[PDB]
Amino acid sequence: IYKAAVEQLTEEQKNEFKAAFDIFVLGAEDGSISTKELGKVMRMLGQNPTPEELQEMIDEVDEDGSGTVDFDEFLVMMVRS
Amino acid sequence: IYKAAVEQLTEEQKNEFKAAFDIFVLGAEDGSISTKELGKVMRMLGQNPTPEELQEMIDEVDEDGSGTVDFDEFLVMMVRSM
Ligand SMILES: CN1CCN(CCCN2c3ccccc3Sc3ccc(C(F)(F)F)cc32)CC1
Ligand SMILES: CN1CCN(CCCN2c3ccccc3Sc3ccc(C(F)(F)F)cc32)CC1
Ligand SMILES: CN1CCN(CCCN2c3ccccc3Sc3ccc(C(F)(F)F)cc32)CC1
Ligand SMILES: CN1CCN(CCCN2c3ccccc3Sc3ccc(C(F)(F)F)cc32)CC1
Ligand SMILES: [Ca+2]
Ligand SMILES: [Ca+2]
Structure with missing residues (x-):
């Protein structure tokens, strides 16, 4: 069901999220979001x-x-939230 | 019509948005979001x-x-944002 919604994303939407994702994983080891980076963003x-x-x-x-x-x-x- | 979805929002939801709004306008001359405050958030x-x-x-x-x-x-x- 969630696989669906993502696929329902346009290049614009995905690129917007990619830009946000990138700034979020700054100084991140594996280039992924851990609780540390997620916490900083929500705060x-x-x-x-x-x-x-x-x-x-x-x-x-x-x-x-x-x-x-x-x-x-x-x-x-x-998608979830 | 987005007036409908806002009604649907729960308090916790509205409360979370308030906390965001409040941090976004810290420094705004009139407690509201102008292009400056919105630009900072976008960036x-x-x-x-x-x-x-x-x-x-x-x-x-x-x-x-x-x-x-x-x-x-x-x-x-x-709400609109979707
Ligand atoms: C108790 N429980 C705590 C968390 N809240 C939801 C927070 C959702 N959220 C949010 C909502 C309003 C204002 C700011 C934020 S920060 C944020 C960042 C990423 C996500 C992301 F990743 F999901 F998209 C969701 C949120 C729900 C109730
Ligand atoms: C179908 N479509 C699915 C996605 N949602 C928007 C999700 C974005 N989001 C969010 C979701 C639920 C509740 C609050 C929030 S605030 C928020 C803050 C930052 C980010 C973040 F990470 F990007 F920075 C994403 C979100 C809109 C409807
Ligand atoms: C030209 N037009 C400009 C705006 N974009 C949508 C921006 C949505 N948005 C967003 C989405 C993904 C990643 C980061 C962001 S920053 C942001 C900040 C506030 C809002 C806020 F306040 F609205 F919720 C919406 C967004 C669509 C195309
Ligand atoms: C259930 N859902 C709850 C609230 N709104 C979504 C708000 C999420 N949001 C958003 C919406 C559409 C497309 C992209 C994004 S990213 C984003 C980034 C920042 C914020 C920021 F900074 F303002 F919080 C809010 C959002 C729609 C319906
Ligand atoms: Ca993983
Ligand atoms: Ca106004």
Whole structure:
């Protein structure tokens, strides 16, 4: 069902998200989003998610068990919420 | 019609948006989001909007024609965004 929504994205939408994804993984080891980068982003947007909530957000879309979110999984994250 | 979705939003949702709105207008001369505050947010999220794109984004939800976005219009900007 979520695979569908992503596919329903236009080049414009995907590129917008890619630009956001890129700035988010700055200074990130594997070039992916971990709880650290996700926390920083949500806090700069005025939110204060707990370490548990951040891990759940990530585990929910971490299909390859990397413990991090790559762009493809990031798109599913966008889709969900 | 986006007036419908705003109604659908839950408090927690509206509360999260308020927290965002509040951080976005820190420093705004009038507590509202002008092109300056919107541009900073867009850029903070890796985007690059022209001054015109920013004006248009504001205009789409500027019901009182203030040239700025207050919290109620912001909710519509969020809902609208889809
Ligand atoms: C308790 N629980 C805590 C988290 N909230 C949802 C936060 C969603 N969110 C958000 C919403 C309003 C204002 C700022 C933000 S930061 C943010 C960043 C990424 C995502 C992302 F990745 F999902 F798209 C979702 C959010 C729901 C309730
Ligand atoms: C179908 N379409 C799916 C995606 N959603 C938008 C998701 C973006 N998003 C979000 C989602 C739910 C609730 C709040 C938020 S605020 C927010 C803040 C940052 C980002 C981030 F990461 F990009 F920076 C993404 C989001 C719109 C409808
Ligand atoms: C020309 N036109 C300009 C705007 N873009 C959409 C921007 C949506 N958006 C967004 C989407 C993905 C990644 C980052 C961002 S920054 C951002 C900041 C605020 C809003 C906010 F306030 F509206 F919710 C919406 C966005 C579409 C095409
Ligand atoms: C369920 N969903 C809840 C709220 N809105 C979505 C807001 C998410 N949002 C957005 C919307 C459409 C396309 C891209 C994006 S990225 C984005 C980036 C920042 C913000 C920022 F900074 F403003 F918070 C909000 C959004 C639509 C319906
Ligand atoms: Ca992963
Ligand atoms: Ca206004």
